[PDB]
Design an enzyme around this catalytic site. Structure first.
Site, mmCIF file in Angstrom:
data_model
loop_
_atom_site.group_PDB
_atom_site.id
_atom_site.type_symbol
_atom_site.label_atom_id
_atom_site.label_comp_id
_atom_site.label_asym_id
_atom_site.label_seq_id
_atom_site.Cartn_x
_atom_site.Cartn_y
_atom_site.Cartn_z
ATOM 1 N N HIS A 40 37.880 -32.916 42.145
ATOM 2 C CA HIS A 40 38.489 -31.825 41.928
ATOM 3 C C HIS A 40 38.387 -31.232 40.351
ATOM 4 O O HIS A 40 38.895 -30.039 39.922
ATOM 5 C CB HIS A 40 40.250 -32.285 42.066
ATOM 6 N N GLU A 52 33.063 -38.861 21.525
ATOM 7 C CA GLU A 52 34.137 -37.924 21.309
ATOM 8 C C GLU A 52 35.484 -38.885 20.760
ATOM 9 O O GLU A 52 35.911 -39.876 21.470
ATOM 10 C CB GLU A 52 34.817 -36.965 22.150
ATOM 11 N N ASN A 54 38.355 -37.016 18.210
ATOM 12 C CA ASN A 54 39.019 -35.587 18.050
ATOM 13 C C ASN A 54 37.963 -34.605 18.855
ATOM 14 O O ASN A 54 37.047 -34.366 18.381
ATOM 15 C CB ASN A 54 39.251 -35.278 16.573
ATOM 16 N N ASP A 84 38.102 -38.202 45.928
ATOM 17 C CA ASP A 84 38.135 -37.431 44.760
ATOM 18 C C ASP A 84 37.079 -38.079 43.862
ATOM 19 O O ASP A 84 37.600 -38.720 42.895
ATOM 20 C CB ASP A 84 39.573 -37.444 43.981
ATOM 21 N N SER A 172 49.135 -41.094 33.355
ATOM 22 C CA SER A 172 48.243 -40.042 32.909
ATOM 23 C C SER A 172 49.060 -38.877 33.511
ATOM 24 O O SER A 172 49.950 -38.691 34.157
ATOM 25 C CB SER A 172 46.752 -40.468 33.815
ATOM 26 N N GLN A 174 48.201 -34.103 33.671
ATOM 27 C CA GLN A 174 47.067 -33.057 33.629
ATOM 28 C C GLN A 174 46.309 -32.879 32.554
ATOM 29 O O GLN A 174 46.585 -33.084 31.241
ATOM 30 C CB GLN A 174 48.004 -31.494 33.784
ATOM 31 N N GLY A 175 44.888 -33.002 32.468
ATOM 32 C CA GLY A 175 43.609 -32.869 31.617
ATOM 33 C C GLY A 175 43.311 -34.280 31.577
ATOM 34 O O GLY A 175 42.138 -34.613 30.896
ATOM 35 N N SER A 177 42.574 -35.952 34.520
ATOM 36 C CA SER A 177 41.817 -36.185 35.659
ATOM 37 C C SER A 177 40.585 -36.243 35.255
ATOM 38 O O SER A 177 39.716 -35.624 34.481
ATOM 39 C CB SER A 177 42.035 -34.852 36.461
ATOM 40 N N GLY A 178 39.806 -37.182 36.019
ATOM 41 C CA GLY A 178 38.302 -37.417 36.043
ATOM 42 C C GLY A 178 38.029 -38.781 35.218
ATOM 43 O O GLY A 178 37.054 -39.074 35.293
HETATM 44 CA CA LIG Z 1 34.711 -34.291 17.824
#
Ligand SMILES: [Ca+2]
Length: 223
Positions: A40, A52, A54, A84, A172, A174-175, A177-178
């Site tokens: 999705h 990553e 920040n 999914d 968890s 929204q954001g 996901s995955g």
């Molecule tokens: Ca960074």
């Protein structure tokens, strides 16, 4: 992630951010060329951001690599979120190091009660909205299939599991996901869906990665 903690920079070295001008989903690095995420989350024009912490500051350990190909599962159904899962191939191989590292695929499915690590840059509020810049983490157990099916009547397939806390407060969101659900060093889940976030009796629902290892391996072997 609601009710979690600040992971610490590069402490989750398989966590990637999928970027299309902004962060929109998580993913997990599974080898130097390939990321696992949620179907999705599919969109064209993905840049994978490795290393990553920040996501709004260049801190020195990042690798930004465009996707060359994305492969949504052959049986993904966007209405039910069954299957999914997607794979994303990188245009160039990542340079693996202590801060940018793949996560192993599981050899067997995990069991209810196993404590896992869930991570991402998603919303940290269950009412209201606040998106973190640094990576957040949550330790949470896998829930029984029966409790999962009871929480979400008619909705849980054999390709899903629940994890979290029936009392609410920790989930968890929204954001996220995955992104990954890692248990004993193996990628067992992908952040998929839930009713709201961190709500009582409505735990997180995750794609059951162990069901897909054969597809993952064969797809990588011919792409
Ligand atoms: Ca960074």
């Amino acid at each position: 992630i609601v009710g979690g903690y600040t992971c610490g920079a590069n402490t989750v070295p398989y966590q990637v951010s999928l970027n299309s001008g902004y962060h929109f989903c998580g993913g997990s690095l599974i080898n130097s060329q390939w990321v696992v995420s949620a179907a999705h989350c599919y969109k064209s024009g993905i840049q994978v951001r490795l290393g990553e912490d920040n996501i709004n500051v260049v801190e020195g350990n990042e690798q930004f690599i465009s996707a060359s190909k994305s492969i949504v599962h052959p049986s993904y159904n966007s209405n039910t979120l069954n299957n999914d899962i997607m794979l994303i191939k990188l245009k160039s191989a990542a340079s693996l190091n202590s801060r940018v590292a793949s996560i192993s695929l599981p050899t067997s499915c995990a069991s209810a009660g196993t404590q896992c690590l869930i991570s991402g840059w998603g919303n940290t509020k269950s009412s209201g909205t606040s998106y973190p810049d640094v990576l957040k983490c949550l330790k949470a157990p896998i829930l029984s299939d029966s409790s999962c099916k009871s929480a979400y009547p008619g909705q849980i397939t054999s390709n899903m599991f629940c994890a979290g806390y029936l009392e609410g407060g920790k989930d968890s969101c929204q954001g996220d996901s995955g992104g990954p659900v890692v248990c004993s060093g193996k990628l067992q889940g992908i952040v998929s869906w839930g009713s709201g976030c961190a709500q009582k009796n409505k735990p997180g629902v995750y794609t059951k990665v162990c069901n897909y290892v054969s597809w993952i391996k064969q797809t990588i072997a011919s792409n």
